[PDB]
């Protein structure tokens, strides 16, 4: 495109593929955090670090569920933010105008001589 | 000396196996419509094997 | 050695004439030489093939 | 030769981490592919879907 | 007394930066009359 | 200690290497394995790999392309090294009234 | 260097911490009096 | 290409680096030609090596026209702006070396 | 890349297993061998995985980090002979190496900053935990407060660059150019402290001495090079303003190199003299960085690579006399040619590497750095000759007075040299002469 | 591992303030159960 | 502090009064909630076993009722000038309102009651004082739009709160002076956002809970008392003392995150000199945090040998070790957070 249109910058074309770690990073990081918190509890009480694995299982399940829930709420928050930005760009076409793209050839600026 | 000889002996076996029993490629013009691969762009068999099986291509990183 | 140090005039004279004055004189000399070469470079008094250190 | 005892069986954990990192790098170079055989330096003529990908 | 020779070869290399190749024998008979090569010769003469 | 004790040294009086000072078994295993992972892997096999490393930098390709370009440039005879980045007719310079008071650097 | 450096910075910070502990050894009425004066200039300017 | 696009800047920077390495090899081979002239014509290097030395000096001059005074971070746009200012200074002040 | 990072992340549970001190350095040398294998890098960023990628400068710095940490586990056998906390030491070393790999393979300026200032906390922990001096508190506080005081406004500069540009990536920030004094001072002065200046050095000779051997390796081997990497990433968009203000730093660095080279002739400690020796060579690195030439940048990268090995190898040599003679004093360390004659090979081979030496990478870094500084101005030929003469005037003094002469009377009986120490100083010198072969690797990052 | 914090080092933390002056040198420490 | 159910009653009514304060749509119902919060925070901060707690409650009463009557007088004056609760052009009555709020909060021109009261308390009423009692004044400060009073308060808070904590060897006065410096970062965030303030306040509250639980379970009130504290493994004492480095704003731990978000939002709001004035005056806070960390960062000490068992609560220390893990490994949760935007 030869124009710097502000509306097409925020409009999702759908060509962006999410990564492998993007949907699954937060539940496994919070599960590892829950397992490490249970290990930290067992270390602070001078228990064996893998004694009472039910606490580790419950902490990991709580972490996986909370990570999935807050990741879904995070995605809904970012979608609403994108809708807000697109709606404010659409509502005010004078403050955000399409700007013609300029080739380097038109511009002439400042080589900094090293010498 | 033991641990430099234990390195050199399989290395020198692989070097004489690559030069004598395989041998380097011969330079030639590109045929029309070939579209050669990245490991075709080097001469030595060890360099070709490293660029084919181990190292990523320049096109992929580019 | 800091516990026996006080800002006297002898210590100020030593710290001025030992460290700050060669630094100031060297910086002034480098700036003067580079400005004198840079005005000749920017004015255009030197040829293209007759300039030192082409990195060639 | 090298001497490895029974404690060398604990070294499967960094090899498992190396396999996990290599799998994540393979997934990353699988995703990062919209400019594959479409850049103007390493380009390909018409009929690129019939031909195999370069990487 | 040889470290001053080391720094004189270092400055001679730094002034052979002008002509690029530090193989001086191919530029001796050509640029015997240049100021930059006279600087090179003075530094390597101090080194010797 | 007597003469026959020094002539035939005891196997229990062993001088340690630098790795462990508790038992002789951990010295030999760590010594042989540390000499394995540094000398015959990082210094010999790694140097053999780096000897036959391909053109990561394009320095060999630069020399081949320079030889072919110097074959073809002096045949055309325009320039051995081109001084201009683009063609001087293709570039559209601004006029003197367009620039005004702008710092032109040379 | 330690003057205009870390040692003299630590000495000046220790002196500033020692002279601020004398501010906090007073009664509550002094600080509340300071607040009452700060209200008092803030109400004199409301007249003007 | 446009200022907002970073796809063109990477590709033009890469061909500028490749052309820099090729032109460096041009100057290197033209210097090695003069060195081989000096070794092969050992007593009489004064007469025969003069066209090669003139060609090498023209190569050094053209290399300093294009890539000269750019610094360690030489983008493709930096040489283009240097060419723009050089052509402007050649238009209004004549050739560099007798400028005002 | 992610293979090395996940390798160290799964090497983290090796610390909690008892009698597992020597397997971690085995796996560290194995991942250094694997990192020697993955060498398909050019001047642009390759192996792009999320926010992690690598170019040639980053490749050399991660390889130096892995080699210095792998030798750092080899040098510290005093931690293993005593019941000092081996698990915490191994965890701190693995965490610090992971942070160095993360701050060198950072694609952007901000993640580089984040892991860059995360790296100083394990160095703090090693200095205040495993040192052998009462002034470890004076050592770590000087380091942390110097680097933190000058690196906090660099964060304001970093977000000012983000607000003006939009991006954090190095390539997109290479396009822009700023004409502000205070942005230049913010984005430069933190690295100007992180590599030693003359005026801002103080944390260096008072933090190298009171640290352990491992603190000395990690400080003079890779954490004087974080500032060099940072300036190599920042100088590209601050060229106009550094060309205005670079004569002050270059003149201060050159006169400070001459003056600190005069300091080392009046030093009575082995570990302090190498600490001031790190100031003189990095002064040449700093003086060649600000000239912005191809040769200055390439020779600066080559001299940082070749200095992180040789200064660390000299710091291992001062440790193996401190373990036996009981003190770091230069008066005590006399005539070690008659005590440890086989060590004297490694003393002179690593002291010659500190100066210009015939087969080392330090000479190829010093030649390409003096080229740019003599090209910068002709007045620098007076003070580069004095600095490079005084460098071997002081560096020969440490080998001469420690390794030649009459023996120090009244020394008690100590152990002889060991194969681990000979292997430790073998791997600090054979990389310095095997890397002139394939030197276009470790020099041409551009 | 050769120097460890001696009672001379923890002497400076035993006062009523960190840096005593002529006023606070005559002060006493609070009770250790804070009541 | 749970010796009686009446204290739980006072806790829920002080929560109710603070929520009445921060949700009032007028300047007088906020004062009503302030008086409810004051009534329920007088019996807490008072006990029979400690002699200093009664005179500290007297100091709290005189300080708050001096601040609440000036807050009422200036709000009635604003209502007498312009009869809506807001003000078109800001004037001196908003300055009197903000100064009366700063006496409530404890900004550094008016902070001298804060460590002098803190010198004689327990570690749970201090936890209520520097966390919940900073909710009611600071949430009213966000309604005013004068800049120079906030500027003077932020600058004076970050120099006076950092320098003044150096001489103090008592842990309560040192934590009060550290909370005065962390107060100034909250008011600097209040000039640019009402959400970044919530970020900084919530994680500063989190760090206050996890750090004052170390001194409440083991009953630590002195710097020298930290050196005599017996932990069975010295690695655990070294690990538990990383909350000081966390709260001081160091990058691998949590606590770097809210300070970093304040830095990110202030630079985007073109305020650079005040940020430099705060961050040159936050190194002193890490200095008296690291002076605490003398007692754990070294690995061996000249301990007193009469005590050989570590005695601790079960439920409180079980709650403590969850929050200690997230105080130092909590930067992994930045990918899950979405409340910065
Ligand atoms: C950058 C840091 C690294 C480089 C510098 C390192 C330290 C260098 C020190 C040095 O060279 O000292 C030379 C020199 C040494 O003097 P000297 O011969 O040792 O002493 C003779 C006199 O006693 C000296 O007289 P004096 O110094 O007592 O008289 C002036 C003094 C008078 O004040 C006092 O005597 C004490 C007053 C109470 C102090 C505690 C409360 C302060 C409350 C804040 C007030 C200002 C707030 C800002 C404005 C708010 C409203 C907008 O006022 C001040 O110094 C103002 C300091 C304000 C606090 C700054 C904290 C750091 C902020 C970042 O000191 C000075 O020149 C003083 C000027 C300040 C130097 C830096 C101090 C840093 C602390
Ligand atoms: C990110 C890290 C990812 C790690 C993925 C693999 C984890 C494997 C954990 C189980 C096996 C560990 C090896 C072993 O023998 O453990 C026994 C050891 C020792 O068990 P122990 O029974 O000897 O207990 C010691 C005795 N007390 C309790 C008194 C101190 O236990 C652990 O290692 C448990 C902690 C797991 C830590 C996992 C790594 C992350 C640490 C981050 C630090 C920063
Ligand atoms: C105490 C913890 C409180 C957590 C945040 C609760 C929500 C606060 C809030 O204002 O949310 C709205 C904000 C902003 O959302 P908002 O502003 O759009 O929402 C307003 C609208 N309502 C309230 C109606 C939904 O969201 C957050 O702050 C979410 C941040 C992440 C929360 C989760 C953090 C912890 C993750 C798991 C940790 C490890 C678990 C495993 C170990 C367990 C051991 C015991
Ligand atoms: C000590 C810090 C370094 C001081 C010297 C470097 C410096 O600032 O050079 C700039 C300048 C260098 O001078 P200059 O080169 O800018 O001066 C040019 C002068 N005309 C225009 C007339 C040709 O330094 C000075 O002028 C003062 C030097 C320091 C004086 C004493 C400072 C004590 C503290
Ligand atoms: C930081 C340090 C990290 C660990 C580094 C460990 C050593 C790695 C050394 C790798 C480089 C290397 O040796 O390359 C071999 C080099 C690579 O060079 P090459 O054979 O590829 O030659 C082309 C390269 N240039 C253009 C630079 C000449 O091999 C040789 O030079 C072969 C002859 C070696 C000389 C004789 C040795 C004794 C027999
Ligand atoms: C010196 C410390 C005080 C500096 C105060 C001025 C800063 C300012 O406002 O700049 C605005 C200027 C201009 O900002 P601007 O470009 O956003 O301007 C927008 C216009 N207004 C402000 C009207 C909306 O910033 C810059 O020039 C860029 C730098 C930004 C970061 C500034 C950090 C200040 C700290 C500097 C420390 C330098 C030394 C560090 C090492 C030593 C530490 C002791
Ligand atoms: C970050 C800074 C490091 C934080 C963790 C410090 C761990 C230090 C360590 O290595 O401790 C080893 C220690 C050995 O046991 P020790 O305590 O000496 O036993 C004495 C018995 N009287 O103790 C142990 O081996 C047992 C305790 C291990 C604690 C492991 C915590 C795991 C956390 C995993 C998730 C990490 C975050 C992911 C998100
Ligand atoms: C570290 C040691 C050195 C430290 C001091 C270095 C000082 C360098 C001084 C020269 C550079 C700055 C001055 C010149 C600026 C540029 C002007 C110029 O080009 O002048 C050249 C000058 C005049 O000659 P011109 O006619 O121009 O052409 C030369 C051939 N016809 O040409 C000449 O005058 C020709 C001679 C030039 C100088 C050559 C010698 C320099 C080194 C002198 C010291 C060492 C000498 C040997 C040892 C003696 C003591 C033991
Ligand atoms: C010119 C650059 C100067 C940079 C100074 C950085 C601060 C520094 O290094 O302070 C060191 C100091 C600890 O000094 P220490 O060794 O404990 O003192 C021994 C007894 N006099 O530590 C301190 O003074 C801690 C407080 C530092 C405050 C820095 C910001 C001040 C504004
Ligand atoms: C009686 C004799 C002394 C009178 C001193 C008067 C100082 C205040 C002058 C003034 O007009 O201050 C108001 C001003 C903010 O008002 P302005 O900037 O006009 O508009 C709001 C938008 N910024 O500025 C401010 O509100 C900022 C503070 C101004 C200076 C305060 C001086 C304090 C005087 C000592 C008080 C000590 C404690 C009691
Ligand atoms: C830690 C170390 C920090 C060092 C920071 C140094 C900051 C100062 C830099 C000084 C500088 O570069 O000054 C250049 C300036 C001349 O610059 P320019 O614009 O080229 O000259 C106009 C010509 N008509 O020259 C000047 O303005 C002259 C400066 C004189 C300073 C006198 C100081 C007395 C004390």
Coordinates of C-alpha atoms in Angstrom, one line a residue, chain H:
Chain H
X1 CA 10.9 2.1 -1.3
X2 CA 9.1 3.9 1.5
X3 CA 10.4 5.1 4.9
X4 CA 7.8 3.1 6.9
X5 CA 8.8 -0.2 5.4
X6 CA 11.6 -2.2 7.2
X7 CA 11.4 -5.1 4.7
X8 CA 13.2 -3.0 2.0
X9 CA 15.7 -1.6 4.5
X10 CA 17.0 -5.1 5.4
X11 CA 17.2 -6.3 1.8
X12 CA 18.9 -3.1 0.6
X13 CA 21.3 -3.1 3.6
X14 CA 22.2 -6.8 2.8
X15 CA 22.9 -6.0 -0.8
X16 CA 24.9 -2.9 0.3
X17 CA 27.0 -5.2 2.5
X18 CA 27.4 -7.7 -0.3
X19 CA 28.4 -5.0 -2.8
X20 CA 30.8 -3.7 -0.1
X21 CA 32.5 -7.1 0.2
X22 CA 32.6 -7.5 -3.6
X23 CA 34.1 -4.0 -4.1
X24 CA 36.6 -4.8 -1.3
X25 CA 37.6 -7.9 -3.3
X26 CA 37.9 -5.7 -6.4
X27 CA 40.4 -3.4 -4.6
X28 CA 42.2 -6.5 -3.1
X29 CA 42.6 -8.2 -6.5
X30 CA 43.7 -5.0 -8.1
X31 CA 46.3 -4.6 -5.4
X32 CA 47.5 -8.2 -5.8
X33 CA 47.9 -7.5 -9.5
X34 CA 50.3 -4.7 -8.7
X35 CA 52.2 -6.9 -6.2
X36 CA 52.5 -9.7 -8.8
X37 CA 53.7 -7.0 -11.3
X38 CA 56.4 -6.0 -8.7
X39 CA 57.5 -9.5 -8.1
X40 CA 57.5 -10.7 -11.8
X41 CA 59.1 -7.5 -13.2
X42 CA 61.7 -7.3 -10.5
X43 CA 64.3 -4.8 -11.8
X44 CA 61.9 -3.0 -14.2
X45 CA 58.9 -2.5 -12.0
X46 CA 58.9 1.3 -12.6
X47 CA 57.7 1.2 -16.1
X48 CA 55.3 -1.8 -16.4
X49 CA 53.4 -1.5 -13.1
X50 CA 52.2 2.1 -13.8
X51 CA 48.9 1.2 -15.6
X52 CA 48.1 -1.2 -12.8
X53 CA 49.0 1.3 -10.2
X54 CA 46.8 4.0 -11.9
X55 CA 43.9 1.5 -12.1
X56 CA 44.4 0.6 -8.4
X57 CA 44.5 4.3 -7.5
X58 CA 41.3 4.9 -9.4
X59 CA 39.8 1.9 -7.6
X60 CA 40.8 3.4 -4.2
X61 CA 39.4 6.8 -5.2
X62 CA 36.0 5.3 -6.3
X63 CA 35.8 3.2 -3.2
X64 CA 36.3 6.3 -1.1
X65 CA 33.6 8.0 -3.2
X66 CA 31.1 5.4 -2.5
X67 CA 31.9 3.8 0.9
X68 CA 34.2 6.5 2.3
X69 CA 33.6 8.3 5.6
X70 CA 30.5 6.2 6.4
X71 CA 31.8 4.7 9.6
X72 CA 31.4 1.2 11.2
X73 CA 27.6 1.4 10.8
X74 CA 27.2 1.9 7.1
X75 CA 23.6 1.4 6.1
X76 CA 22.3 1.5 2.5
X77 CA 20.5 4.7 3.2
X78 CA 23.7 6.4 4.6
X79 CA 25.6 5.9 1.3
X80 CA 22.5 7.2 -0.6
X81 CA 22.3 10.4 1.5
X82 CA 26.1 10.8 1.1
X83 CA 25.6 10.5 -2.7
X84 CA 22.8 13.0 -2.5
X85 CA 24.9 15.6 -0.6
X86 CA 27.9 14.8 -2.9
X87 CA 25.9 15.4 -6.1
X88 CA 24.4 18.6 -4.6
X89 CA 27.9 19.9 -3.7
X90 CA 29.1 19.0 -7.1
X91 CA 26.2 20.9 -8.6
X92 CA 26.6 24.1 -6.6
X93 CA 30.3 24.2 -5.7
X94 CA 32.0 22.3 -8.5
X95 CA 34.2 19.2 -7.8
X96 CA 35.5 18.7 -4.3
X97 CA 39.0 19.8 -3.9
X98 CA 38.5 23.3 -5.4
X99 CA 35.3 24.1 -3.5
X100 CA 34.3 27.3 -1.8

